[PDB]
Write a protein that binds this ligand. Structure first.
Ligand SMILES: *[C@@H]1O[C@H](CO)[C@@H](O[C@@H]2O[C@H](CO)[C@@H](O[C@@H]3O[C@H](CO[C@H]4O[C@H](CO)[C@@H](O)[C@H](O[C@H]5O[C@H](CO)[C@@H](O)[C@H](O)[C@@H]5O[C@H]5O[C@H](CO)[C@@H](O)[C@H](O)[C@@H]5O)[C@@H]4O)[C@@H](O)[C@H](O[C@H]4O[C@H](CO)[C@@H](O)[C@H](O)[C@@H]4O[C@H]4O[C@H](CO)[C@@H](O)[C@H](O)[C@@H]4O)[C@@H]3O)[C@H](O)[C@H]2NC(C)=O)[C@H](O)[C@H]1NC(C)=O
Ligand code: YAI
Ligand code: CA
Ligand code: CA
Ligand code: CL
Ligand code: NA
Ligand code: NA
Ligand code: ZN
Length: 805
């Protein structure tokens, strides 16, 4: 119930929300059907439109008009945005030359530069260049301020997940808004775009920017706008809030536009009808900037121009139907479109089986345009599993396509020509970032970055401490003139042991053998030097990784590689080695094919054993430092130490062997040497965070040897490829991956072919940031370089995407 007989008189666009049954006058009142009876009359005036004209200049004030051109309008704060241009001989902001803003130039009483976030729905990255001739105000923001060529959204590339990620710095799995549509099985409730359940705060996790501000004494504009409030009234409302008295005035504001998304769904991303929505959004930016110029705020406010996601070509005819794969299609519920999510239609059906649904959806048609996954098997870069609202069965849909349950879902609903939602590395899903103002840099291009990083920066711009989030604070310091956040490296928690030779061969009873009994004072002192770390500067280029949790581990040195060996997990946490451009690949010799050797620095009780692998008929083994890349026949023996062995399914060894024998050398030839750090990952609860020992669900049969869920590698070289990886003076270049450790290659539909046709394609799909690996291992990389810490933080957030330009 609402008692709509109250009045909005002196309350239009009030900032404090009033509680039912009292009637509302705020920018969301329409969306709840709760505005007072006179809200349209008083708060949504339209008389005489949005622009002054010559005849109106100097007019006697008429309170009915939408905006004013009377002499008193500047002091009331309610002039039309073009007033000074039409009536006082001023220029539009867009016609003024850009001039560096070295310091804030703010009116008296302003405690800090305000922040205005100008957000645009469906604004694809390439619009900034392709539309530049029809967007002069936006082009001036971009060219004069700080811009990225694009900004990466979060998966799924939908509106509700992305806007809430911008507001919170969190992945959707953590903030809870995992799609525009959701079922929560604990609540037994459904969230939808239409309807009232979406207003309940139980859906919305984390802490959004407006709340962070309010809790720390920084006042905020209300961010959400009811759809029927025209854009011109949204801008006038912001400008009026900026004329409030000092103690009442917000410091942070948001504008939102439904365009160009609305038209892009109808016409496609580059349909000829798309020019006009782009012109109109530019004209709105012009109104805002002219308005700021009138208030003497155009060299005081920080403005962010930012989008939620892009837009791809998609038509009804490019739809895959589950009714062409499943016998049982009426027993499932599908969340459809540019991603699929599947669950049982009834919880009382004990004949529902996820394994049979997955198998019926796997590599069944030659050009199949989606791929099924259990959520824990999705690329770790998507960070899309740790939430009860994400269904166990997921379909990753190819760009340009849809999935649906049955054909009648598609014509009892062609209309549309664009859509979005796909994998967040897809080029057409990329969106926009520009920052303009005293706190941003002047005429500066920055590299692409992820939208999860912006919350921290917005907090920096306002002097706020961020709530705990998924950004890496400091990684965007290169965007800012001042207000940078200067973090310190985390402290190492566990220090390593440095064991010497402590065990005789006969103390081991591991069931392993090796043909190594083959026998010199020159070379003996030399090999002793290698075991004490004489080559470590060659193979450990950026310091040892720091261990950020409590554990017991040993540093082990060798001619060709260095490792950090866990006494708890019975294997390395990390293994580090450098391969020059000139390095040679060799075979595993015939006599050494099944060789495994006890390590006389490590006790039998803290070693793996070969008998466990013999008896586990599903499990084999591989090596972290590859025997193929040994520096000499004599050094190759080190690669068969028991302390370099890890458990590997035979199907996974196909992938791993090809990476180590072929691809490492290819990268060294292409990048002028590479440093490689490889290791295991254990994430059985799919939370993106290092598992403790008591979370491990699978062991090599009959043993305490834990089975990794994934294997990583971090591959680093010199950004200036004229210098070799091991003699680099300047910035670094990195690519990394997190490969799923699976007992089949069912993910790769062409796996019966030679590895040259499918392995690298798999690895590209499972591309990763160094930061992703840090979360999954409790390790901290790049501790000893010549580079500034903020530069290293940027490096750790880089993702190699393998998309063309
Ligand atoms: C990205 O950034 C985020 C933010 O930093 C990272 O997320 C944090 O990770 C922590 C570890 O997973 C986690 O810490 C836990 O918090 C528990 C209390 O949480 C409540 O309070 C906080 C603070 O206000 C709040 O944010 C939480 O919000 C979650 O839950 C509500 C609904 O309840 C949602 O609306 C909201 O969206 C959010 O959901 C997300 O997180 C939860 C987990 O909290 C998931 O289950 C959801 O799927 C979703 O992803 C809560 O309101 C606290 O109780 C935990 O402590 C347990 O573990 C410790 C180990 O040290 C143990 O000592 C304790 O005893 C305790 O165990 C007991 O409970 C167990 C479970 O019942 C039981 O089995 C035991 O036997 C014990 O009884 C823990 O400290 C922190 O909450 C989140 N924060 C957020 C916002 O998500 C995220 O990891 C980053 N991602 C990456 C990849 O880096
Ligand atoms: C979601 C979300 N999370 N946080 N925010 C705030 C936020 C955060 C940021 C930011 F600063 F973070 F960038 C910038 C801007 C905002 C305000 C967003 C806003 O005003 N809404 C946009 C999304 N909307 C819709 O898509 C929509 C369409 C149609 C119907 S209907 N008429 O069919 O019912 C309802 C809803 C409604 C308006 N929005
Ligand atoms: Ca959107
Ligand atoms: Ca985990
Ligand atoms: Cl109403
Ligand atoms: Na075996
Ligand atoms: Na296959
Ligand atoms: Zn859309």
């Amino acid at each position: 119930w609402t008692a709509t007989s109250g009045s909005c008189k002196g309350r239009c666009f009030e900032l404090q929300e009033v509680g039912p049954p009292d009637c509302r006058c705020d920018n969301l009142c329409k969306s709840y059907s709760s505005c007072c009876h006179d809200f349209d009359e008083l708060c949504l005036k339209t008389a005489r439109g949005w622009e002054c004209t010559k005849d109106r200049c100097g007019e006697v004030r008429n309170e009915e008009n939408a905006c004013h051109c009377s002499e008193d309008c500047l002091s009331r704060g309610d002039c039309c945005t073009n007033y000074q241009v039409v009536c006082k001989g001023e220029s539009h902001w867009v016609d003024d030359d850009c001039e560096e803003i070295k310091v804030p130039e703010c009116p008296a009483g302003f405690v800090r530069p305000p922040l205005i976030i100008f957000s645009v729905d469906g604004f694809r990255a390439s619009y900034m260049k392709k539309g530049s001739k029809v967007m002069p105000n936006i082009e001036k923001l971009r060219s004069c301020g700080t811009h990225a060529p694009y900004m990466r959204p979060v998966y799924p590339t939908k509106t509700f997940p992305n806007l809430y990620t911008l507001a919170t710095g969190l992945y959707p799995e953590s903030h809870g808004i995992v799609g525009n549509s959701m079922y929560d099985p604990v609540f037994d409730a459904s969230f939808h775009l239409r309807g009232r359940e979406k207003f309940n705060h139980r859906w919305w996790g984390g802490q959004p920017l407006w709340i962070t501000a309010t809790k720390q004494g920084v006042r905020a504009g209300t961010f959400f706008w009811s759809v029927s409030i025209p854009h011109e009234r949204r801008i006038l409302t912001i400008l009026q809030w900026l004329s409030l008295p000092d103690n009442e005035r917000p410091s942070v504001y948001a504008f939102y536009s439904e365009q160009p998304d609305f038209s892009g769904h109808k016409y496609g991303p580059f349909g000829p009808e798309m020019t006009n929505p782009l012109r109109e959004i530019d004209k709105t930016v012009g109104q805002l900037m002219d308005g700021l110029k009138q208030l003497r705020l155009h060299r005081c406010v920080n403005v962010i121009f930012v989008g939620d996601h892009g837009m791809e070509d998609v038509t009804c005819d490019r739809t895959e139907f589950l009714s062409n794969y499943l016998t049982n299609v009426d027993d499932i519920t599908l969340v459809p479109g540019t991603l699929g999510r599947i669950r049982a239609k009834s919880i009382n059906n004990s004949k529902y089986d996820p394994k049979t649904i997955i198998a019926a959806l796997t590599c069944k048609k030659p050009d199949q345009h989606f791929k099924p996954y259990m959520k824990q098997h999705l690329p770790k870069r998507l960070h899309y599993a740790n939430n009860r609202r994400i269904e166990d069965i997921h379909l990753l849909v190819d760009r340009r396509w849809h999935v649906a349950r049955k054909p009648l879902d598609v014509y009892k609903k062609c209309f549309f020509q664009g859509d979005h939602g796909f994998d967040n590395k897809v080029n057409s899903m990329q969106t926009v970032f520009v920052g303009y103002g005293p706190t941003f840099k002047y005429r500066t291009k920055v590299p692409p970055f992820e939208n999860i990083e912006l919350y921290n920066v917005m907090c920096d711009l306002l002097g706020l401490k961020p709530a705990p989030n998924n950004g890496t604070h400091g990684s965007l310091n290169h965007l800012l003139r001042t207000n940078t956040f200067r973090p310190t490296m985390p402290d190492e928690v566990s220090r390593p042991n440095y064991p010497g030779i402590m065990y005789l061969q006969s103390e081991f009873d591991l069931g392993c053998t090796c043909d190594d009994k083959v026998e010199n004072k020159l070379e003996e002192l030399n090999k002793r030097l290698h075991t004490k770390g004489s080559t470590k500067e060659r193979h450990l280029l950026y310091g040892r990784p720091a261990v950020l949790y409590r554990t017991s581990y040993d540093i082990l040195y060798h001619t060709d590689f260095e490792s950090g060996y866990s006494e708890i997990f019975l294997m390395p946490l990390w293994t580090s080695y450098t391969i020059s451009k000139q390095a040679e690949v060799s075979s595993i010799p015939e006599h050494l094919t099944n060789c495994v050797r006890p390590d006389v620095r490590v006790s039998p009780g803290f070693s793996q054993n070969c008998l466990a692998y013999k008896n586990d008929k599903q499990m084999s083994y591989g090596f972290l430092f590859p025997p193929y890349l040994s520096s000499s026949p004599e050094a190759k023996y080190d690669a068969f130490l028991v302390t370099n062995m890890v458990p590997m399914y035979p199907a996974f060894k196909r992938v791993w062997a090809y990476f180590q024998r072929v691809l490492v050398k290819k990268y060294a030839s292409e990048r002028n040497g590479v440093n490689v750090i490889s290791g295991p990952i254990f994430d059985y609860n799919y939370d993106g965070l290092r598992d403790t020992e008591d979370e491990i669900k699978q062991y090599v049969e009959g043993s305490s040897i834990p089975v990794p869920t994934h294997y990583y590698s971090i591959i680093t070289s010199c950004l200036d490829f004229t210098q070799p990886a091991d003699k680099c003076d300047g910035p670094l270049s990195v690519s990394s991956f997190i490969l799923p450790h699976r007992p089949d290659n069912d993910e790769s539909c062409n796996s019966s072919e030679d590895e040259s046709k499918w392995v690298e394609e798999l690895m590209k799909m499972h591309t990763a940031r160094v930061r992703d690996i840090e979360h999954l291992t409790g390790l901290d990389f790049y501790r000893k370089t010549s580079r500034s810490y903020s530069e290293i933080l940027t490096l750790k957030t880089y993702l190699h995407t393998y998309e063309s330009e």
